[PDB]
Design a protein around this ligand. Sequence first.
Ligand code: HEM
Length: 153
Amino acid sequence: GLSDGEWQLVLNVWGKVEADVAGHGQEVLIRLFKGHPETLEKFDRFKHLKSEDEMKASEDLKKHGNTVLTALGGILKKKGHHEAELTPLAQSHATKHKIPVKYLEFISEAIIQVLQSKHPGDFGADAQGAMSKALELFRNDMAAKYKELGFQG
Ligand code: HEM
């Protein structure tokens, strides 16, 4: 799974995200949207955004960013014993928002992109390794809840 070591590496980086959750949150959405624009159409609420600047000015794009990462950090914190935190997520995304898993891959990549950007120092070869596996765990588990809800896969 993740070694005990791999978890503490994960939890160390995340201590960085927790000093600025709304700020990290906002960049990962803009990352996502400007990297894979199609993702944007999934948000009624942000489809009105026509540029990065308009994305950076958006107070609600910021609040939503804080919501994604607060919720991803309560999961990460469980260090793979996240069953109760993941279900509802998998429920809304699968049954209400209709998010394909590949989209989950997309945001995973934007999240590494943001850490790599803001914390090169704090995010070396090992923290990179740790985080990428913490996210693939998260993706795998979403995927499988998907599959059980009889959704797309
Ligand atoms: C790290 C992965 C993600 C996490 C933790 C996350 C978290 C959430 C949370 C906590 C909410 C509010 C409660 C709910 O409706 O579930 C939400 C809503 C939403 N999510 Fe996600 N999300 C993730 C990935 C995605 C992706 C990739 C997309 C689209 C490509 C997306 C689309 C949506 C939409 C369309 C909504 C409703 C937005 C709103 O009106 O608040 N989510 N998400």
